[PDB]
Protein backbone atom coordinates (compact mmCIF):
# COMPACT_ATOMS: atom_id res chain seq x y z
CA UNK A 1 0.00 0.00 0.00
CA UNK A 2 0.70 3.71 -0.27
CA UNK A 3 0.77 6.68 1.94
CA UNK A 4 -2.74 9.08 0.52
CA UNK A 5 -2.06 12.48 -0.72
CA UNK A 6 -3.50 15.09 1.54
CA UNK A 7 -6.59 16.43 0.27
CA UNK A 8 -7.13 20.13 -0.22
CA UNK A 9 -10.14 21.58 2.25
CA UNK A 10 -11.57 24.49 1.93
CA UNK A 11 -12.94 27.07 4.22
CA UNK A 12 -16.51 28.20 2.41
CA UNK A 13 -19.87 29.99 3.46
CA UNK A 14 -23.47 30.47 2.41
CA UNK A 15 -24.73 34.05 2.49
CA UNK A 16 -27.96 34.01 4.71
CA UNK A 17 -28.14 37.84 4.60
CA UNK A 18 -27.54 38.56 8.37
CA UNK A 19 -24.44 36.50 8.61
CA UNK A 20 -22.27 34.03 6.60
CA UNK A 21 -22.68 30.09 7.63
CA UNK A 22 -19.22 29.03 7.62
CA UNK A 23 -18.51 25.21 6.40
CA UNK A 24 -15.23 23.26 5.62
CA UNK A 25 -15.33 21.91 2.20
CA UNK A 26 -13.55 18.45 1.70
CA UNK A 27 -14.90 16.24 -2.00
CA UNK A 28 -18.24 17.19 -2.78
CA UNK A 29 -19.70 17.89 0.91
CA UNK A 30 -19.35 20.59 3.00
CA UNK A 31 -19.03 19.91 7.00
CA UNK A 32 -21.05 22.59 9.19
CA UNK A 33 -22.58 23.72 12.32
CA UNK A 34 -26.31 22.46 12.06
CA UNK A 35 -27.59 25.75 12.33
CA UNK A 36 -29.74 28.18 10.43
CA UNK A 37 -28.94 31.05 12.79
CA UNK A 38 -25.47 32.29 13.92
CA UNK A 39 -27.19 34.18 16.98
CA UNK A 40 -29.22 31.21 17.89
CA UNK A 41 -26.12 29.02 18.00
CA UNK A 42 -24.44 31.73 20.04
CA UNK A 43 -27.21 32.45 22.99
CA UNK A 44 -27.75 28.72 23.01
CA UNK A 45 -24.04 28.17 23.70
CA UNK A 46 -24.28 24.62 22.15
CA UNK A 47 -23.79 23.16 18.50
CA UNK A 48 -23.44 20.19 16.36
CA UNK A 49 -21.64 19.54 13.01
CA UNK A 50 -23.69 18.43 9.72
CA UNK A 51 -22.66 17.76 6.55
CA UNK A 52 -24.43 19.16 3.08
CA UNK A 53 -23.84 18.62 -0.52
CA UNK A 54 -21.60 21.46 -2.21
CA UNK A 55 -23.43 23.30 -4.20
CA UNK A 56 -22.36 26.59 -6.05
CA UNK A 57 -24.17 28.96 -3.44
CA UNK A 58 -20.97 28.03 -1.49
CA UNK A 59 -18.35 30.83 -1.80
CA UNK A 60 -14.96 29.59 -1.25
CA UNK A 61 -12.32 32.31 0.87
CA UNK A 62 -9.50 29.91 1.73
CA UNK A 63 -7.85 26.65 0.64
CA UNK A 64 -5.37 24.71 2.47
CA UNK A 65 -3.70 20.98 2.85
CA UNK A 66 -5.84 18.50 5.51
CA UNK A 67 -4.58 15.18 6.59
CA UNK A 68 -6.33 12.46 4.75
CA UNK A 69 -6.23 10.45 7.96
CA UNK A 70 -8.12 13.29 9.79
CA UNK A 71 -11.40 13.37 7.52
CA UNK A 72 -13.02 11.19 9.88
CA UNK A 73 -12.69 13.56 12.77
CA UNK A 74 -15.21 15.45 10.96
CA UNK A 75 -17.35 12.20 9.62
CA UNK A 76 -17.33 10.77 13.21
CA UNK A 77 -18.70 14.64 14.24
CA UNK A 78 -21.74 14.37 11.97
CA UNK A 79 -22.19 10.77 12.33
CA UNK A 80 -21.88 10.89 16.17
CA UNK A 81 -24.83 14.09 16.52
CA UNK A 82 -22.95 15.24 18.96
CA UNK A 83 -23.32 18.21 20.97
CA UNK A 84 -20.59 20.68 22.12
CA UNK A 85 -20.72 23.91 23.70
CA UNK A 86 -19.24 27.15 22.61
CA UNK A 87 -19.27 28.98 25.66
CA UNK A 88 -17.45 26.75 28.31
CA UNK A 89 -13.98 29.41 27.83
CA UNK A 90 -12.18 27.88 30.55
CA UNK A 91 -11.92 24.47 30.30
CA UNK A 92 -11.18 24.94 26.88
CA UNK A 93 -8.20 26.77 27.49
CA UNK A 94 -7.32 25.20 30.46
CA UNK A 95 -7.58 21.74 29.17
CA UNK A 96 -7.66 21.02 25.55
CA UNK A 97 -5.51 23.54 24.82
CA UNK A 98 -3.06 24.19 27.21
CA UNK A 99 -3.08 20.40 28.21
CA UNK A 100 -0.29 19.85 25.71
CA UNK A 101 -1.49 16.44 24.94
CA UNK A 102 -2.88 15.50 20.92
CA UNK A 103 -6.23 16.93 21.28
CA UNK A 104 -9.04 14.57 21.01
CA UNK A 105 -11.15 13.78 18.83
CA UNK A 106 -13.89 15.46 20.67
CA UNK A 107 -11.85 18.19 21.66
CA UNK A 108 -10.27 18.70 17.81
CA UNK A 109 -14.15 19.33 16.98
CA UNK A 110 -15.27 21.71 19.73
CA UNK A 111 -12.24 24.14 18.83
CA UNK A 112 -13.39 23.36 14.79
CA UNK A 113 -16.88 24.44 15.62
CA UNK A 114 -15.67 27.41 17.79
CA UNK A 115 -13.91 28.62 14.81
CA UNK A 116 -16.76 28.42 12.36
CA UNK A 117 -19.10 30.10 15.00
CA UNK A 118 -16.61 33.12 15.19
CA UNK A 119 -16.20 33.07 11.42
CA UNK A 120 -19.98 33.36 11.50
CA UNK A 121 -20.09 36.14 14.43
CA UNK A 122 -17.67 38.33 12.41
CA UNK A 123 -20.00 38.47 9.57
CA UNK A 124 -22.27 39.84 11.35
CA UNK A 125 -20.36 42.84 11.95
CA UNK A 126 -21.99 45.40 8.85
Given at each position: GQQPQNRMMKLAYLDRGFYKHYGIIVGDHVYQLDSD???KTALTGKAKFT???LTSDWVIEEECELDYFRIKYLESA????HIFSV???CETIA??????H???QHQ???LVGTILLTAGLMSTIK
Open positions: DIFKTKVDSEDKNKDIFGTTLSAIG
